Design a protein around this nucleic acid. Structure first.
Ligand SMILES: [Ca+2]
Ligand SMILES: [Ca+2]
Ligand SMILES: [Ca+2]
Ligand SMILES: [Ca+2]
Lengths: 152, 153
DNA sequence: TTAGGATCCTTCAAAAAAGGCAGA
DNA sequence: TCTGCCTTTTTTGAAGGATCCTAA
């Protein structure tokens, strides 16, 4: 649990509200208890020419990594505990993505509980729906309703 | 007077501008201006129109400028020279990606009065416009300092 | 089984220009 | 002439997913 400087968080919140994404996904997979897994991602995208900015972000946040897809690169943070700490500190300063951040926090806090109960897993999937609705979602496939086929 | 902007607003806004903003300098052909071209300087923030309220708030906070809709997106735009200069002066220290463009815009604005008085000074200021376009992800630019250099006629 | 990572696609939502008009 | 508003176009640079892999 790093603590960040306020001036860094203020600037970063603005940058994330611009070029960032707070992403929650339900991924079908037969080896998981409820035939699906939850994936939570904080991402910041930038033309690879400016990957240096993302590399600096790695250093400054102190966790995560940068992946180059050719034309653009992405800073990525997915590991649950660091993501929780980071978003806890970022969230107060967000204006466009605040609600997404807080839903990701609520999801993370319920994960242990969602592992034990299909009712509970479903409910957490509905919060994933809400995050997608808050985002500019356009290619989504798997939703809580797909899962609700734990009806069975 | 020049509006004084608050620190936490400038810090957040600097991040947001490095994200979705644009600092733009243009040379616009126009036969009714002294050297057949007008310099135009713009600070712009783009956002999908469902989030226009965020751009509308910028008009309130910055206290000048306007919002325009186009297709599915809207833009906050500030091009009025004196307020733009005051705003970018205060924003520039917190910029990380667009700091150089901000500082070039400030330099150009400072030189406008004497740009309007010699071909060679006008040309030089135009090369500063070239430098901003280079720093930006320029892709549709037409009129450059070389276009101007047709003051040669 | 579970979590994190790898690799890629889909579709814009931005960016960064290009222009034009009409009053003072 | 000037300047400050207006209005469109072009081409991405982002966003926001999708899905396979494998060590733990
Ligand atoms: Ca954005
Ligand atoms: Ca939406
Ligand atoms: Ca950007
Ligand atoms: Ca460039």
């Amino acid at each position: 649990n790093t603590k960040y400087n306020k001036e860094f968080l203020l600037y970063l919140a603005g940058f994330v509200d611009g070029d960032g994404s707070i992403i929650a996904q339900i991924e079908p997979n037969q080896s998981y208890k409820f035939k699906h897994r939850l994936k939570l991602t904080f991402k910041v995208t930038q033309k690879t020419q400016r990957r240096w900015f993302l590399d600096k972000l790695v250093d400054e946040i102190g966790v995560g990594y940068v992946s180059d897809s050719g034309s653009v690169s992405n800073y990525i943070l997915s590991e649950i505990k660091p993501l929780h700490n980071f978003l806890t500190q970022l969230q107060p300063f967000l204006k466009l993505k605040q609600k997404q951040a807080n839903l990701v926090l609520k999801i993370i806090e319920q994960l242990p509980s969602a592992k034990e109960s299909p009712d509970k897993f479903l409910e957490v999937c509905t919060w994933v729906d809400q995050i997608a609705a808050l985002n500019d979602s356009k290619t989504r496939k798997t939703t809580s309703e797909t899962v609700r086929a734990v009806l069975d």
